[PDB]
Amino acid sequence: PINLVVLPVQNDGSTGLHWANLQKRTPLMQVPVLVDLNGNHLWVNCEQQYSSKTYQAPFCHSTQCSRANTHQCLSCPAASRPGCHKNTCGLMSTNPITQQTGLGELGEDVLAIHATQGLGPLVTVPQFLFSCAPSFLVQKGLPRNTQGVAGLGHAPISLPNQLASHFGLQRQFTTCLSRYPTSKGAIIFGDAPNNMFQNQDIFHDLAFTPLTITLQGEYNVRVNSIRINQHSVFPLGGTMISTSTPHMVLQQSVYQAFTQVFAQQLPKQAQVKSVAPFGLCFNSNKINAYPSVDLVMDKPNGPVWRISGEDLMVQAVTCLGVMNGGMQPRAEITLGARQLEENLVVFDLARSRVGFSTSSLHSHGVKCADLFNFANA
Amino acid sequence: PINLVVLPVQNDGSTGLHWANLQKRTPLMQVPVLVDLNGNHLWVNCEQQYSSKTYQAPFCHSTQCSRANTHQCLSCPAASRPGCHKNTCGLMSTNPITQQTGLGELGEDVLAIHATGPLVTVPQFLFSCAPSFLVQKGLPRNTQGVAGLGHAPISLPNQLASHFGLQRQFTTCLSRYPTSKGAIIFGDAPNNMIFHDLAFTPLTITLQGEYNVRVNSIRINQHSVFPSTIVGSTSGGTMISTSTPHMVLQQSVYQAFTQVFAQQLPVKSVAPFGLCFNSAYPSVDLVMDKPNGPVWRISGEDLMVQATCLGVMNGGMQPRAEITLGARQLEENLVVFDLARSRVGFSTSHGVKCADLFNF
Amino acid sequence: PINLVVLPVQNDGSTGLHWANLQKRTPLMQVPVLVDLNGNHLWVNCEQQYSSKTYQAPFCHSTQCSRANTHQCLSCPAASRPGCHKNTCGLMSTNPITQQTGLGELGEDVLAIHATLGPLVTVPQFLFSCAPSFLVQKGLPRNTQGVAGLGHAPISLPNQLASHFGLQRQFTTCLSRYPTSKGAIIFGDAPNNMFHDLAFTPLTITLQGEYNVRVNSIRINQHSVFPLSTIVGSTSGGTMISTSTPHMVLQQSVYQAFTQVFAQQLPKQAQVKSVAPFGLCFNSNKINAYPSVDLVMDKPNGPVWRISGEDLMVQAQPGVTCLGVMNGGMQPRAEITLGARQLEENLVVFDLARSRVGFSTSSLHSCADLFN
Amino acid sequence: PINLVVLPVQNDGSTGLHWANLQKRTPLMQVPVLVDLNGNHLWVNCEQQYSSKTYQAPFCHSTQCSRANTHQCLSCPAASRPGCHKNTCGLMSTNPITQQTGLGELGEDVLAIHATLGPLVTVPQFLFSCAPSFLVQKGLPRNTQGVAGLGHAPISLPNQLASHFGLQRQFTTCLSRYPTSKGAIIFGDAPNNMDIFHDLAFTPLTITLQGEYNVRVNSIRINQHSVFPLGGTMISTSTPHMVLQQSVYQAFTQVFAQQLPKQAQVKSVAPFGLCFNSNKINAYPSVDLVMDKPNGPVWRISGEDLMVQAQPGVTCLGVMNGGMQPRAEITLGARQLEENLVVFDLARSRVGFSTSSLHSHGVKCADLFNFA
């Protein structure tokens, strides 16, 4: 009776990005991969080392290629091995940090992951679908020695969809990303709010906003306004949620309005020169008392996604962790990994809504890393 | 746990097609629908007095619309009712008998089905409220829509296997006897209940969402009738279908076939058939996949119909496939669609009856 | 330098649909084909009678398949001939009258058409589909063997013709109300190569390939009928212009509003027993003037597409004339559809370059004169 | 009567890539762009200058957005400017050197091009994308502001130019071999309109799902020694060298080396793998590509033309290892298109090349037209 499965995820201190050791292949081995909230699928570099007794490449026009949504047939002029076959299916994979994309082949192999009643036994998808993507794609932008990307996007062979389908889980997943490199957070597949902590009602304040999917397969929500200490800075789906930037990203005109109203809410004298890659920094000794950021979601009548000033700030000298996305970012506002860390964020694919707590996880005395004991497993 | 779910399916003697009573809505009610093996999705006429407590039409750009692969937004300039909303998602539904297609609206409601047993549910089963003109011609009497079993993201088997965590496969046991009911079993039937002699052949899915296999040869009573660099190939070229009762052949294959079939025997053809008799029939052997392949065998009498006539039609110069196997060739034959392994399984101690398998 | 190309179009009185003879093949022959304004392409019956020295079925993955936007390969077991090949590309064709669709194969052959009255000029490699013959069985005017699509799709007639000869990316329909005189489709910039009372409204294309405009309001004798970052839910106009239906079609709620308001513009006593296929019929002779229907385009004060009431009326029986507006039920593809009868005796400029549809705000005086 | 249009394109010595100054906007200005033979469209960074009186961003669901194959609507939260509007269309653009792709906005403006040496003729409503600026940051030749695609895609350079002027649906490349020198792209039927094309041979052209031109190589020999097989082949200007899948690379480079004396080999200069002392070589081996099928026509590469001057006294084999999964097992780069007439016939789905060298007629690509 499997109701949840759970993947440990770690915060990479050097990049601010989140990544995981996936258990794949026969025998099981650890494959380090970026966690890309918006990614279409799981892809890894197979050009390398690849040992498995259970690896298979589906044939062109197969049900597996249809499920993966590719009718592009490929062939390789060379002895067959993972990544190189006669008559297989081709899939474009994306490095979401550089935005590079390249052509690889669809593969199947074992993926293993812990079940959890709400720690539990290790269960497997014996023919988990993924792509052997070309190696140039791992060369830039990813945490050291990452070999791939696990996409959690709403696409037919993404992690959440493949896991939910195989185990009959509710078609949703919950992220609890860690703020701290020293301790692993979790991604929970299945209905966490109903099937999952130690007397604490961590979901008590869950509120919901509608979820859309862009044509590029990204999760979008809609922000009705941004207020900083009750002063509105915006206006004047639409909002992407993403783990391919650590920081909040704002379209340039929104960036200028935001940062200026932010500054204004602090003492003018507290401003110091900026350290890269930030624009707006402060002497932190000079004032502890950061403005609160309310994102009013969907429509004027709430609910409110609250960001405390302190959690927007980076200990760089403290700097505002908000980036100028230029004239044409993909979304006018993007909530990045730091906005996800230490919050329970529910992506409900069945009902098309994102759930979020109006109150802080930590108010329960709980950190995302406290959720599961991965050291026993 | 649940590892098997079953839909009773009924043989309609007047059309030669099959149909199920789907259980939907709150409170549950019965929705007669044609079973279309290659259908993309379940659709229904929602002008047919739609009562439900649990009906929703997903909004444009939602997760459900994305899953159904539509980014087309619609609005109905009318009040709000099932099939008429503002800001919902459009999708094309097909009447696969007439081949008509029409733009309808993505809906969500409860569907109930039997486990193997008791009735279990998909609270959010996705389907389409299709335009009512699509139920006017060709369907079995009183049917209100079509339930698609094609390999497409919101087809019946995909939704059910995903919800219950079944093995990605379904088996077909249609009954030959008009008014009798066989079943479609979802999940790993071969391991979860006769499946000793399962041959197997590769399955491809066409761009239009149809199941294909490849037929290397056809014989009538042993007589031959038939016949990451990018590449660019084709599917099998033989379609399995329940949207025709009859075997359909490309004109030239049809001539060869029927003629050779005539020669295995010693009247005034009766419409729509081109070869009829008074009332031993020769056997048809289909070598599957390639020259070494397992053989799909249809005994002659099972091709034959009573207007007795050869139930093999002329699909003209350009049918979808060179060869199509219709409803009658699936009847009283256990056909396993393994979507996880991309192959179709079939029965090479007589056959019992599809109608014997269950009791509802 | 060729500036226009012109195709005569015949009104079939028996169906109200419009058809043309397309000149193709080598040797050149006539192929009678339905004119489908919203159709993706030209499709034609290749069932075995087809024969031509210049016909080829492009190979899968060819530039011609790429242009037609199909990467679906097929093959045929019989001896090779048009419609039947070893490695070709598949294309879905639609009968717009019955809404049947079916898979056929991309074909290529010579098409000839008159320049500007001028000589016959040719497109040597004109792309079209060999469609399954079941597609011609039903709903097509007599003897029709295919459908010429004028849709905004990459191998439609207007696009191929404009492209081959370097015409302006537009065409003008001037359908005839009278079967005995043929009207014209004019490819290229008709307004600058042949009146001035042209109004324009934005043109959008639906995902199924249809032309849409936006009707801000429908009025009858000025009375309102209709009615009282990734951007997300945008839609195209919501009014379709089609030559696949003869009459105006309205979604059932709009239909009822329209009929109630139309009727209110005339004496209740003039009404008479309904006569199929119609729902609102009148004692002819008890009416001197029928209400005008004004479609205000784009915005509440945009340009107006005006229909005279006489032109929306049909005479069914001896002394009884009926309203030529059909009930499209709950889910027509568009809430309002203007049909062949609304396009007859009017110039309509489909400008694909500027995405606008242009129509006269003073109809000639109520198409066959332009050419001969 | 316009039959050909020609674009001077210049060889960049640093990157080995080719680029062009496109004349756009009102008033006209020079917009430097990389020439990407497989590029889907023309894209530019609009953030920067963009001065024009004739720029326009089509609206969502317009005929222009449909042509470009996008039904994705964009809103920009800012005030109106090029690259930033409400209700426009989104298009993904690709930097073909880094393989980065990003979302930009469909735009329309004037593009001027020389007709035939002849006068500047214009496309008033030329479609392109305002692509996000991160796409220009790496790997393009210095100062280029975007990319001009020549792929077989509906709004590519050759398609828009052929359609606007009624050209034959083909183009010929004559890329110049020497740094800063100028070759030409000629749109229209170059072979029939200006024998240097007397010996044109032809091989089937296919288009991949990512929109790249492909042909098939049936075999490769070096000095008549078999290298391949034991043949999908992309033609590209986004790599300056030949690229081979790893097992083909190993065989090719081995056989190439053993045709030369083994003491000729010096230490490898990055990025190359096989380099030589250029004192110790007097003749390089011929590389022969049999196209399409066992008995097809032969694309001949003189071996000297495969070699790169890495240093003062060192010459390297300009053949790169594409690893396990390059897009095509063989790729013919910029260097293989240099000083060679290559005809991309989109109408007939074939690529044409001369069995006899352009230099054996005494001609160089830079000779064809006098630009300035």
Side-chain angles (χ1 to χ4, degrees), chain B residues 228-230, chain D residues 326-327 329:
Chain B
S228 73
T229 254
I230 283 149
Chain D
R327 288 182 192 200
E329 55 203 59

Side-chain angles (χ1 to χ4, degrees), chain D residues 28-78:
Chain D
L28 276 180
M29 56 173 273
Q30 295 254 93
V31 174
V33 297
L34 171 74
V35 175
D36 173 23
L37 171 68
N38 298 137
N40 178 86
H41 58 259
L42 195 218
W43 60 266
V44 120
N45 175 27
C46 296
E47 221 134 323
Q48 165 176 8
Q49 273 184 322
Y50 223 97
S51 194
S52 188
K53 301 178 175 156
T54 37
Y55 165 87
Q56 191 200 271
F59 57 79
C60 210
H61 306 320
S62 54
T63 59
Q64 305 99 316
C65 301
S66 167
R67 200 176 163 193
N69 248 288
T70 183
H71 270 267
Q72 179 173 9
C73 305
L74 301 176
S75 42
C76 177

Side-chain angles (χ1 to χ4, degrees), chain A residues 269-345:
Chain A
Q269 298 179 343
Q271 275 162 263
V272 159
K273 283 181 188 175
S274 73
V275 182
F278 305 100
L280 180 52
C281 305
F282 301 82
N283 181 310
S284 50
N285 316 151
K286 277 188 207 149
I287 314 84
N288 298 315
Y290 291 99
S292 58
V293 182
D294 296 335
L295 276 39
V296 176
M297 310 301 294
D298 182 37
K299 54 176 208 182
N301 204 96
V304 172
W305 180 305
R306 178 149 298 165
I307 296 158
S308 81
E310 193 174 305
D311 304 333
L312 256 193
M313 300 306 304
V314 190
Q315 315 81 351
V317 177
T318 187
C319 296
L320 175 58
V322 178
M323 307 318 295
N324 190 349
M327 190 194 285
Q328 300 171 256
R330 286 185 194 200
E332 68 211 7
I333 299 150
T334 296
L335 302 186
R338 286 189 44 102
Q339 284 73 67
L340 270 19
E341 290 166 12
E342 301 309 328
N343 302 125
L344 264 9
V345 186

Side-chain angles (χ1 to χ4, degrees), chain C residues 81-219:
Chain C
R81 281 182 194 175
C84 170
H85 282 99
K86 84 310 251 139
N87 180 36
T88 58
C89 304
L91 203 42
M92 295 300 280
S93 288
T94 297
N95 177 330
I97 309 311
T98 59
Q99 293 175 258
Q100 289 170 292
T101 185
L103 187 82
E105 47 136 68
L106 192 66
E108 179 183 275
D109 212 337
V110 158
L111 183 148
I113 189 173
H114 296 275
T116 293
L117 159 143
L120 225 33
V121 298
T122 72
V123 184
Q125 293 106 22
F126 186 95
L127 306 174
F128 65 101
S129 166
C130 283
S133 63
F134 86 80
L135 280 189
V136 335
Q137 299 309 347
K138 208 171 171 280
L140 303 180
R142 325 209 176 201
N143 290 317
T144 285
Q145 280 190 45
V147 182
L150 312 183
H152 184 58
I155 70 170
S156 72
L157 258 68
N159 287 319
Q160 283 195 76
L161 288 181
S163 295
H164 191 71
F165 296 104
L167 310 171
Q168 294 289 300
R169 259 265 206 289
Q170 59 174 89
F171 62 98
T172 299
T173 68
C174 206
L175 299 188
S176 179
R177 171 172 299 130
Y178 321 101
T180 335
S181 68
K182 35 181 82 151
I185 312 160
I186 316 153
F187 301 97
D189 186 342
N192 297 314
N193 294 293
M194 275 185 48
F195 224 58
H196 282 316
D197 292 281
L198 249 45
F200 282 98
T201 196
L203 186 56
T204 52
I205 302 314
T206 69
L207 268 172
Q208 285 74 51
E210 297 126 353
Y211 297 112
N212 269 202
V213 294
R214 185 201 294 147
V215 178
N216 186 93
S217 51
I218 296 176
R219 308 150 162 172

Side-chain angles (χ1 to χ4, degrees), chain C residues 3 8 41 102 107 160 164-165 167 173 176 188 190 198 224 226 234 242 249 251 265 294 298 329 341 359-361:
Chain C
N3 293 135
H41 52 259
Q160 283 195 76
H164 191 71
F165 296 104
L167 310 171
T173 68
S176 179
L198 249 45
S224 185
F226 175 80
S234 184
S242 132
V249 187
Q251 197 273 0
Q265 306 322 312
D294 282 333
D298 187 39
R341 292 183 88 260
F359 54 85
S360 186
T361 60

